[PDB]
Design a binder for this molecule. Sequence first.
Ligand code: NA
Length: 290
Amino acid sequence: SCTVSEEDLTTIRNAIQKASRASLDDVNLDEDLIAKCPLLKTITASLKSVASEIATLKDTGISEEQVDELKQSYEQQVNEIVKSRDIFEKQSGGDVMKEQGAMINRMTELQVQVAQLQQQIGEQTSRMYDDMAELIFQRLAMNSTDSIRNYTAHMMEQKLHTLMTKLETNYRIFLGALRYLDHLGDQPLIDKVFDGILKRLDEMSLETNKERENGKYVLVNLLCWTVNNRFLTEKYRKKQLELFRIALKFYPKTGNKEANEADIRGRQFCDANFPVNVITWFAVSRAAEG
Ligand code: NA
């Protein structure tokens, strides 16, 4: 259950407003207060998540003009929640002594509005990542069959390597690239990019935690990309043995299946079992046959 006192609701309101600002700091609520209403934990986790995602945007090559448009959108949307009379203000008129006035119902409506804000910002940033990925393909002159038609094999390989070094450092950029290729419907380009992803996965260094993180997201979502796509599923089929080799490189200890599966599912942006099956089952079984 959730009980909040009248004055504690006022400090929740101010703590939410303070999370909207240019500093985007973590909501720091007293533990006694969190204890009486643990629902607050997921609200504060949501706002932290949005701010941490806006911070990642700055690190990329996205223009700080666009980051400013995003930060003001976030700020306006949080102020809308702060101003909500159903959540924070006394019941008035025909609302006096409605059930909605109970603190549990105010906090539930706060959780809904914060969850919907997180979804809306998620949609905006996801569009920004689409645009950034496309810009990468354009700047590298790799954005169509026509652009790549007159590349030698050596230059094509060189271009694909450069492309992967830019896509792999932020999995949301990588996902944006996959969405851009899907919508373009240029199959010779998809064919080559698939080869390029496999070659990077097969050879990239895995010395640091950041490199293993980059590779694992790329591997898992490459597999997701093939699901329900005949052409990409056929590409998986032809390069099956190489993907098994890559899978056991990123997920070596075949015995800790449960932890690997949880790790894989946390990086997945499809809902399919196929990435888990490839990495923790097919690859493990096929290395063992002989
Ligand atoms: Na108060």
